[PDB]
């Protein structure tokens, strides 16, 4: 036993008022196959995919802590066997480990909400009307409680379709601490679960590849080697900084967790901050060479104005940038040659700069007429003059549909930036300025080509420096493709670039991380 | 099964480009001359191993025009992206040691284009006299 | 406590039919817990849930009455029985999970949801009594062999839920835990065998010699005091005095103490109208074996410090009366922008300043250094100007650790500099020729050395020996601190590389 | 009893693995005299000469707290009777009172090191 007993050890499964429920005895005569699951799964508990939660003193009463629905997605086994079979039945047993410090208070309530109940609000007045259990956030032992299967069809299908007896809890009366100094003990929870007496799968089908319960695999490659998603350059260090604007809307390196692209994120690593176009070279007695570029997708397919605010891979910063172009001029003896053009983004007081419509412009200070024949060509950048990490004029000055800003963060969470530096042409100082994405290009090309199924709201990550083997921070990953990290300092904070981001478990939005 | 034969870089951006510590001087002939000491593009040092060159080093012959960021010590100019003319093939006269980590580059400038030493990555701007044979 | 889902596992009843003898154990070992010193850990409020506190494998190495008793026998077979003591008071909270990983498993990182899918116990950090649990022997061969580190059931202990406690201004309340382990009822040894001493269970014992007598490793001169200096470069890449604890010889380190800073070669003397009598030595290893350009940056014993030094060479002069004579030469080591000193290829150019055409004769030569000039503790040009495969720089130290030095002094010609600044090495040669002459097996990452005075007995500090061949020392001062040079190094145990020493 | 029991009350002599040991029954036929010590010394415990020690948070692990050798110098009586007689035998029972505040942690280990063991490091 522990020491001591100024805690409250609820070891008993509280009496829930609900009859027993038959499991795989109503699907035996209607699933034409015998099946059993390895009898050593029924023996030890084990953490669910969604295992973790936190009850921080800021959480008001009524905030649903963990709302987990009965199904095969409640073990690491039962969610990895359920890629072969098609359908399940039967009960389950869920533990609940919340053993907060002996200087806390406040109580939670767990309510076996039945099927066919409208998801949504479930306020603190109608969480006790269900068959519930009240337990204190100081409870020492694990608090077992059942998760029966109330249904009207024999065996559910193993696609997320069906509706089953959710088991939602609620921070009934808030957690408040009692220790005499400058600290409130966030109680972390855990969730272990094992299939009940007669859980069982039904029909045996091929273990399809793109199944529905793939947890997540983040690519095992160091951020030092990955490629940035806003400039054709490697990643040179990741860091957190509250000083910079903490809600940008970069239109590059912006992918959901389940692969759905957002805005103007290319899929290549070379399509980044560049574009292909049908050129139109002409000359006039002012600056010289003028190119009226008609935009087109970098692969060759024709551009069309759509929901995204530019062709795939168009640069989403502001400032003057130079451009390299392979042109075939008519001058004899020198036919093929790469030349450098210049293009200014953002308002210019002479701005038919409509990357959304499909027209942009470039100007080279040529004395004579650069006799260049028009032709399809791509344009890779070489240097930026007036860098400003803001949206350029995607129309002339008009409105254009684009990706929402990166948010929202909890109180005290900062965006975790993968930072690179770009070539700079300036005159005064010699500090090459920095741009930063939310996910390196490998992560985009990975999520776009896997199409996982996001479970609740976020993936709790980690950072294991492989050389020594110690953790570095505990960062949370929202589904909108940004990595929020809890942080409190004023100046920036840079991390080493040898870690391997490894997914840990699903987690709701309200998870109060560990500060750094 | 994952093994990386040859000198293939992992990032899709390291391809055909290399980072190096620069050392510019100005001979009174061809012009500026930079003696890049090669370094793995992520920053870590280089040692002669069993791959032909640092990760991402190009494997096609021909005089290659690189585009590189540099800083000058003149007046009114602080940063500037310039170009160079590197020779990749045997060229019959070059103390080029991509295996040992020393590569020459030059321009055509009669004046003394003074540039301060530093660390620079040479992305390829253009090719000339291409051949699909190992340099 | 010890209620985990694992069938009983048989030993010494499954490998008796195919083992000649089945030897027993002094039965006063089955009644005494003992600690394997890599089985210690210290949770702290700043540890994210998921770290691995201790990860240790079943074997006879967990119980020094077995790591020693396993020099007389050929093979062991059977179970063990371990227990874990967590030293926390009743105002803390936060669980810890112990898992019995089976003996064929891709090592690496186990996130806190993969450590609980195993068989496992969970226990709080408020448990007085030890958390007993068994370490069965899941194997596939009948009985393991003692001279063969083969895989066996491992214990992994993971911080499941972070620690939540108050803490004063000093020193932030670590919850320390320890592990102990004794043989189960049927852990038997198999075949008796004459006791060979160099079995692979041996704490790496250091020679009992005061650092004031040991021969230095980079310049042929005795050690003249050891010190710590956080101001000097904290990650040098000297190419001599570089030996891993497990025997290998990194860099150009020679196994003698007399090969240091001096090379042997075939000399080629020729006169010039300028500097006079120049010489182009084609290198060779001193003992006589031919030299080939390999993975080390130079022949064994070549210097690793930039600066001009003169060499002393016997030259069989063909003059009349002066047949044999030892003369001084002059050689430049640094780059100096004009020098064809290519040791990596095997060519070193050393000259003199003489006006006469004194007719030397070529032949074998060994060149002892005489005096440095313009010393620079940086690499000479091992190639013409190219790179060369050399030893990696010493490191890396934990935050709050500085390299230990072994400073010697060297001859030096100058004009105004009077203070004899000079070189230092990582380990005196009496340690290099001692780690290469035993081939100790290395347990984890670093030994817990201890520098005890020989007569007073009182400690001086606790240096940590990183097996990559250096000695880190926990320190926070600003200036170079100097230590007495008449103590004795002595080992204590192995220790995880995350160990934190006692500041001095 | 005290108040309360967020402490850990080890009242039991832990089981040490060592056989009993005969005391003054191996010296009765080879010391030509009858002797006994006042039977009221065997009744109450009493502080040794070396009685006190302190475990401060600065003490690292491994610092020997109290290394006391069996002999007559472990009572104020047995060290004041042992100025008459010449020689002793036999066992002894030692208490150990360490009852730190209920807000502490950390553990000590006591080891009955046998004779003829080289003093020093341990």
């Amino acid at each position: 036993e522990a020491s001591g007993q100024d805690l409250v050890p609820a070891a008993v499964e509280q009496a829930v008022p609900i009859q027993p429920v038959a499991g795989a005895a109503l699907a035996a005569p209607a699933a034409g196959q015998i099946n059993q699951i390895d009898p050593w799964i029924f023996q030890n508990f084990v953490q669910c995919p969604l295992g973790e939660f936190s009850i921080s003193p800021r959480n008001t009463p009524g905030e649903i802590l963990f709302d987990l629905a009965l199904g095969p997605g409640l073990n690491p086994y039962l969610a990895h066997l359920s890629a072969m079979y098609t359908g399940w039945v039967g009960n389950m047993e869920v533990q609940l480990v919340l053993a907060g410090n002996a200087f806390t208070a406040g109580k939670v309530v767990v309510a076996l909400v039945p099927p066919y109940f409208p998801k949504g609000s479930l306020t603190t007045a109608q969480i006790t009307c269900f068959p519930h259990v009240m337990c204190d956030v100081r409870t020492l032992e694990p608090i077992q409680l059942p998760l029966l299967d109330v249904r009207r069809v024999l065996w559910h299908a193993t696609q997320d379709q069906e509706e089953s007896m959710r088991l939602v809890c609620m921070l009934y009366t808030p957690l408040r601490t009692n220790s005499p100094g400058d600290e409130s003990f966030v109680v972390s929870g855990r969730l272990l679960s094992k299939p009940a007496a007669d859980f069982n799968f039904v029909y045996l089908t091929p273990p399809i590849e793109r199944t529905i319960y793939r947890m997540v695999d983040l690519p095992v490659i160091q951020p030092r080697l990955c490629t940035h998603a806003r400039w054709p350059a490697p990643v040179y260090g990741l860091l957190v900084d509250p000083s910079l604007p903490s809600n940008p809307q970069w239109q590059n390196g912006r992918v959901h967790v389940d692969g759905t692209l957002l805005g103007t994120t290319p899929i290549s690593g070379s399509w980044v901050s560049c574009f292909a176009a049908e050129a139109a070279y002409k000359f006039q007695s002012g600056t010289g060479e003028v190119a009226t570029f008609t935009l087109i997708e970098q692969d060759g397919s024709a551009y069309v104005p759509g929901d995204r605010a530019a062709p795939l891979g168009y640069p989403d910063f502001s400032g003057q940038l130079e451009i390299e172009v392979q042109t075939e001029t008519t001058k004899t003896g020198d036919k093929l040659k790469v030349t450098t053009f210049e293009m200014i983004l953002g308002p210019t007081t002479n701005a038919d700069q409509a990357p959304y419509q499909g027209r942009v412009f470039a100007s080279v200070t040529a004395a004579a007429s650069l006799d260049l024949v028009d032709g399809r060509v791509r344009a890779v950048p070489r240097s930026i003059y007036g860098f400003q990490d803001t949206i350029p004029e995607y129309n002339d000055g008009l409105l254009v549909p684009l990706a929402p800003p990166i948010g929202p963060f909890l109180p005290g969470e900062v965006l975790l930036r993968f930072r690179t530096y770009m070539r700079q042409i300036d005159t005064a100082d010699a500090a090459a300025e920095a741009i930063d994405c939310a996910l390196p290009q490998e992560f985009v090309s990975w999520f776009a080509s896997n199409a996982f199924t996001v479970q609740s709201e976020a993936l709790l990550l980690r950072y294991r420096n492989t050389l020594t083997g110690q953790l570095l921070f505990e960062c949370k990953l929202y589904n909108e493709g940004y990595i929020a990290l809890s942080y409190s300092g004023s100046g920036p904070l840079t991390f080493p670039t040898d870690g391997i981001f490894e997914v840990v478990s699903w987690v709701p939005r309200l998870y109060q991380l560990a500060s750094v």
Side-chain angles (χ1 to χ4, degrees), chain A residues 25-44:
Chain A
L26 309 193
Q33 211 159 12
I34 278 182
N35 289 281
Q36 80 179 0
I37 66 188
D38 184 334
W40 293 95
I41 306 186
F42 296 148
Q43 302 294 345
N44 68 332

PDB file of all heavy atoms in Angstrom, chain A residues 25-44:
ATOM      1  N   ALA A  25     -23.259 -13.813 -28.633  1.00  0.00           N
ATOM      2  CA  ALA A  25     -24.204 -14.908 -28.646  1.00  0.00           C
ATOM      3  C   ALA A  25     -25.427 -14.586 -29.475  1.00  0.00           C
ATOM      4  O   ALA A  25     -26.299 -15.440 -29.624  1.00  0.00           O
ATOM      5  CB  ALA A  25     -24.618 -15.269 -27.224  1.00  0.00           C
ATOM      6  N   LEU A  26     -25.525 -13.367 -29.991  1.00  0.00           N
ATOM      7  CA  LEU A  26     -26.545 -13.000 -30.955  1.00  0.00           C
ATOM      8  C   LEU A  26     -25.985 -12.882 -32.357  1.00  0.00           C
ATOM      9  O   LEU A  26     -26.730 -12.543 -33.276  1.00  0.00           O
ATOM     10  CB  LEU A  26     -27.206 -11.676 -30.580  1.00  0.00           C
ATOM     11  CG  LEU A  26     -27.743 -11.470 -29.181  1.00  0.00           C
ATOM     12  CD1 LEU A  26     -28.599 -10.249 -29.189  1.00  0.00           C
ATOM     13  CD2 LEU A  26     -28.531 -12.660 -28.764  1.00  0.00           C
ATOM     14  N   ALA A  27     -24.695 -13.110 -32.541  1.00  0.00           N
ATOM     15  CA  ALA A  27     -24.106 -13.088 -33.864  1.00  0.00           C
ATOM     16  C   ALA A  27     -23.512 -14.423 -34.255  1.00  0.00           C
ATOM     17  O   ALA A  27     -22.954 -14.535 -35.344  1.00  0.00           O
ATOM     18  CB  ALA A  27     -23.030 -12.008 -33.958  1.00  0.00           C
ATOM     19  N   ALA A  28     -23.601 -15.432 -33.403  1.00  0.00           N
ATOM     20  CA  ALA A  28     -23.059 -16.733 -33.780  1.00  0.00           C
ATOM     21  C   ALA A  28     -23.858 -17.376 -34.900  1.00  0.00           C
ATOM     22  O   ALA A  28     -23.243 -17.897 -35.845  1.00  0.00           O
ATOM     23  CB  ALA A  28     -22.967 -17.639 -32.550  1.00  0.00           C
ATOM     24  N   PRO A  29     -25.189 -17.392 -34.881  1.00  0.00           N
ATOM     25  CA  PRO A  29     -25.925 -17.997 -35.992  1.00  0.00           C
ATOM     26  C   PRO A  29     -26.169 -17.076 -37.175  1.00  0.00           C
ATOM     27  O   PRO A  29     -27.022 -17.394 -38.002  1.00  0.00           O
ATOM     28  CB  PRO A  29     -27.253 -18.364 -35.330  1.00  0.00           C
ATOM     29  CG  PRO A  29     -27.460 -17.290 -34.391  1.00  0.00           C
ATOM     30  CD  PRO A  29     -26.115 -16.978 -33.817  1.00  0.00           C
ATOM     31  N   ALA A  30     -25.484 -15.949 -37.277  1.00  0.00           N
ATOM     32  CA  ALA A  30     -25.700 -15.093 -38.431  1.00  0.00           C
ATOM     33  C   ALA A  30     -24.405 -14.477 -38.914  1.00  0.00           C
ATOM     34  O   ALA A  30     -24.417 -13.380 -39.475  1.00  0.00           O
ATOM     35  CB  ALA A  30     -26.709 -14.001 -38.127  1.00  0.00           C
ATOM     36  N   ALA A  31     -23.279 -15.144 -38.679  1.00  0.00           N
ATOM     37  CA  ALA A  31     -21.997 -14.763 -39.271  1.00  0.00           C
ATOM     38  C   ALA A  31     -21.302 -16.062 -39.634  1.00  0.00           C
ATOM     39  O   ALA A  31     -20.717 -16.715 -38.772  1.00  0.00           O
ATOM     40  CB  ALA A  31     -21.147 -13.937 -38.325  1.00  0.00           C
ATOM     41  N   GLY A  32     -21.340 -16.416 -40.906  1.00  0.00           N
ATOM     42  CA  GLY A  32     -21.018 -17.767 -41.300  1.00  0.00           C
ATOM     43  C   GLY A  32     -19.562 -18.124 -41.146  1.00  0.00           C
ATOM     44  O   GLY A  32     -18.925 -18.551 -42.108  1.00  0.00           O
ATOM     45  N   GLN A  33     -19.030 -17.975 -39.937  1.00  0.00           N
ATOM     46  CA  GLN A  33     -17.644 -18.330 -39.694  1.00  0.00           C
ATOM     47  C   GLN A  33     -17.371 -18.317 -38.200  1.00  0.00           C
ATOM     48  O   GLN A  33     -17.916 -17.485 -37.472  1.00  0.00           O
ATOM     49  CB  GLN A  33     -16.696 -17.369 -40.411  1.00  0.00           C
ATOM     50  CG  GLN A  33     -15.420 -18.028 -40.824  1.00  0.00           C
ATOM     51  CD  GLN A  33     -14.740 -17.290 -41.924  1.00  0.00           C
ATOM     52  OE1 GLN A  33     -15.111 -16.168 -42.243  1.00  0.00           O
ATOM     53  NE2 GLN A  33     -13.740 -17.915 -42.527  1.00  0.00           N
ATOM     54  N   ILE A  34     -16.530 -19.241 -37.753  1.00  0.00           N
ATOM     55  CA  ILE A  34     -16.057 -19.282 -36.377  1.00  0.00           C
ATOM     56  C   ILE A  34     -14.887 -18.326 -36.231  1.00  0.00           C
ATOM     57  O   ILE A  34     -14.014 -18.265 -37.099  1.00  0.00           O
ATOM     58  CB  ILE A  34     -15.655 -20.710 -35.987  1.00  0.00           C
ATOM     59  CG1 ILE A  34     -16.885 -21.509 -35.586  1.00  0.00           C
ATOM     60  CG2 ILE A  34     -14.674 -20.696 -34.862  1.00  0.00           C
ATOM     61  CD1 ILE A  34     -16.573 -22.914 -35.141  1.00  0.00           C
ATOM     62  N   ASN A  35     -14.863 -17.564 -35.139  1.00  0.00           N
ATOM     63  CA  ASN A  35     -13.761 -16.653 -34.885  1.00  0.00           C
ATOM     64  C   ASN A  35     -13.546 -16.503 -33.391  1.00  0.00           C
ATOM     65  O   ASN A  35     -14.498 -16.479 -32.612  1.00  0.00           O
ATOM     66  CB  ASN A  35     -14.010 -15.285 -35.496  1.00  0.00           C
ATOM     67  CG  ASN A  35     -13.933 -15.312 -36.971  1.00  0.00           C
ATOM     68  OD1 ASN A  35     -12.852 -15.304 -37.537  1.00  0.00           O
ATOM     69  ND2 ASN A  35     -15.075 -15.369 -37.618  1.00  0.00           N
ATOM     70  N   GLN A  36     -12.285 -16.395 -33.001  1.00  0.00           N
ATOM     71  CA  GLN A  36     -11.951 -16.053 -31.634  1.00  0.00           C
ATOM     72  C   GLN A  36     -10.743 -15.142 -31.677  1.00  0.00           C
ATOM     73  O   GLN A  36      -9.969 -15.170 -32.633  1.00  0.00           O
ATOM     74  CB  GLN A  36     -11.650 -17.283 -30.780  1.00  0.00           C
ATOM     75  CG  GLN A  36     -10.257 -17.829 -30.973  1.00  0.00           C
ATOM     76  CD  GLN A  36      -9.971 -19.029 -30.096  1.00  0.00           C
ATOM     77  OE1 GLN A  36     -10.823 -19.461 -29.327  1.00  0.00           O
ATOM     78  NE2 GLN A  36      -8.764 -19.574 -30.206  1.00  0.00           N
ATOM     79  N   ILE A  37     -10.595 -14.325 -30.661  1.00  0.00           N
ATOM     80  CA  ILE A  37      -9.426 -13.471 -30.542  1.00  0.00           C
ATOM     81  C   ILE A  37      -8.531 -14.040 -29.456  1.00  0.00           C
ATOM     82  O   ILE A  37      -9.015 -14.541 -28.437  1.00  0.00           O
ATOM     83  CB  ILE A  37      -9.823 -12.011 -30.263  1.00  0.00           C
ATOM     84  CG1 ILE A  37     -10.487 -11.860 -28.917  1.00  0.00           C
ATOM     85  CG2 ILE A  37     -10.803 -11.535 -31.284  1.00  0.00           C
ATOM     86  CD1 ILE A  37     -11.027 -10.487 -28.733  1.00  0.00           C
ATOM     87  N   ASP A  38      -7.222 -13.980 -29.688  1.00  0.00           N
ATOM     88  CA  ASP A  38      -6.166 -14.577 -28.884  1.00  0.00           C
ATOM     89  C   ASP A  38      -6.491 -14.473 -27.403  1.00  0.00           C
ATOM     90  O   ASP A  38      -6.617 -13.366 -26.881  1.00  0.00           O
ATOM     91  CB  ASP A  38      -4.851 -13.869 -29.207  1.00  0.00           C
ATOM     92  CG  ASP A  38      -3.660 -14.470 -28.504  1.00  0.00           C
ATOM     93  OD1 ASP A  38      -3.823 -15.078 -27.430  1.00  0.00           O
ATOM     94  OD2 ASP A  38      -2.535 -14.319 -29.025  1.00  0.00           O
ATOM     95  N   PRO A  39      -6.615 -15.592 -26.686  1.00  0.00           N
ATOM     96  CA  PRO A  39      -7.097 -15.537 -25.303  1.00  0.00           C
ATOM     97  C   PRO A  39      -6.170 -14.835 -24.340  1.00  0.00           C
ATOM     98  O   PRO A  39      -6.493 -14.775 -23.152  1.00  0.00           O
ATOM     99  CB  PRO A  39      -7.233 -17.012 -24.921  1.00  0.00           C
ATOM    100  CG  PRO A  39      -7.257 -17.734 -26.178  1.00  0.00           C
ATOM    101  CD  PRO A  39      -6.411 -16.971 -27.126  1.00  0.00           C
ATOM    102  N   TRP A  40      -5.027 -14.324 -24.782  1.00  0.00           N
ATOM    103  CA  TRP A  40      -4.159 -13.535 -23.922  1.00  0.00           C
ATOM    104  C   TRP A  40      -4.394 -12.047 -24.074  1.00  0.00           C
ATOM    105  O   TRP A  40      -3.653 -11.259 -23.490  1.00  0.00           O
ATOM    106  CB  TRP A  40      -2.691 -13.847 -24.202  1.00  0.00           C
ATOM    107  CG  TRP A  40      -2.300 -15.220 -23.823  1.00  0.00           C
ATOM    108  CD1 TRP A  40      -2.263 -16.302 -24.633  1.00  0.00           C
ATOM    109  CD2 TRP A  40      -1.888 -15.670 -22.535  1.00  0.00           C
ATOM    110  NE1 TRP A  40      -1.862 -17.405 -23.930  1.00  0.00           N
ATOM    111  CE2 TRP A  40      -1.624 -17.036 -22.637  1.00  0.00           C
ATOM    112  CE3 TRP A  40      -1.725 -15.049 -21.305  1.00  0.00           C
ATOM    113  CZ2 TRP A  40      -1.205 -17.787 -21.563  1.00  0.00           C
ATOM    114  CZ3 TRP A  40      -1.310 -15.796 -20.244  1.00  0.00           C
ATOM    115  CH2 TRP A  40      -1.054 -17.147 -20.375  1.00  0.00           C
ATOM    116  N   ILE A  41      -5.384 -11.645 -24.864  1.00  0.00           N
ATOM    117  CA  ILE A  41      -5.781 -10.249 -24.876  1.00  0.00           C
ATOM    118  C   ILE A  41      -6.749  -9.981 -23.749  1.00  0.00           C
ATOM    119  O   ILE A  41      -6.758  -8.888 -23.184  1.00  0.00           O
ATOM    120  CB  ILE A  41      -6.406  -9.859 -26.221  1.00  0.00           C
ATOM    121  CG1 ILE A  41      -5.485 -10.216 -27.376  1.00  0.00           C
ATOM    122  CG2 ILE A  41      -6.669  -8.398 -26.249  1.00  0.00           C
ATOM    123  CD1 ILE A  41      -5.988  -9.736 -28.693  1.00  0.00           C
ATOM    124  N   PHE A  42      -7.569 -10.959 -23.395  1.00  0.00           N
ATOM    125  CA  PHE A  42      -8.536 -10.776 -22.327  1.00  0.00           C
ATOM    126  C   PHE A  42      -7.900 -10.670 -20.953  1.00  0.00           C
ATOM    127  O   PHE A  42      -8.641 -10.500 -19.982  1.00  0.00           O
ATOM    128  CB  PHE A  42      -9.531 -11.930 -22.305  1.00  0.00           C
ATOM    129  CG  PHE A  42     -10.386 -12.021 -23.518  1.00  0.00           C
ATOM    130  CD1 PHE A  42     -10.826 -13.233 -23.971  1.00  0.00           C
ATOM    131  CD2 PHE A  42     -10.759 -10.903 -24.196  1.00  0.00           C
ATOM    132  CE1 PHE A  42     -11.610 -13.320 -25.078  1.00  0.00           C
ATOM    133  CE2 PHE A  42     -11.544 -10.997 -25.302  1.00  0.00           C
ATOM    134  CZ  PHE A  42     -11.969 -12.203 -25.740  1.00  0.00           C
ATOM    135  N   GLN A  43      -6.579 -10.768 -20.831  1.00  0.00           N
ATOM    136  CA  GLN A  43      -5.950 -10.921 -19.525  1.00  0.00           C
ATOM    137  C   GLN A  43      -5.423  -9.621 -18.943  1.00  0.00           C
ATOM    138  O   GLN A  43      -5.651  -9.351 -17.764  1.00  0.00           O
ATOM    139  CB  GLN A  43      -4.811 -11.932 -19.594  1.00  0.00           C
ATOM    140  CG  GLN A  43      -5.238 -13.287 -20.059  1.00  0.00           C
ATOM    141  CD  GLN A  43      -6.168 -13.957 -19.093  1.00  0.00           C
ATOM    142  OE1 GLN A  43      -6.287 -13.542 -17.946  1.00  0.00           O
ATOM    143  NE2 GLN A  43      -6.837 -15.005 -19.546  1.00  0.00           N
ATOM    144  N   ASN A  44      -4.702  -8.818 -19.712  1.00  0.00           N
ATOM    145  CA  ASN A  44      -4.138  -7.599 -19.158  1.00  0.00           C
ATOM    146  C   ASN A  44      -4.764  -6.382 -19.810  1.00  0.00           C
ATOM    147  O   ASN A  44      -5.049  -6.385 -21.009  1.00  0.00           O
ATOM    148  CB  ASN A  44      -2.621  -7.533 -19.311  1.00  0.00           C
ATOM    149  CG  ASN A  44      -2.189  -7.396 -20.728  1.00  0.00           C
ATOM    150  OD1 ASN A  44      -2.867  -7.840 -21.636  1.00  0.00           O
ATOM    151  ND2 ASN A  44      -1.069  -6.734 -20.935  1.00  0.00           N
TER     152      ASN A  44
END
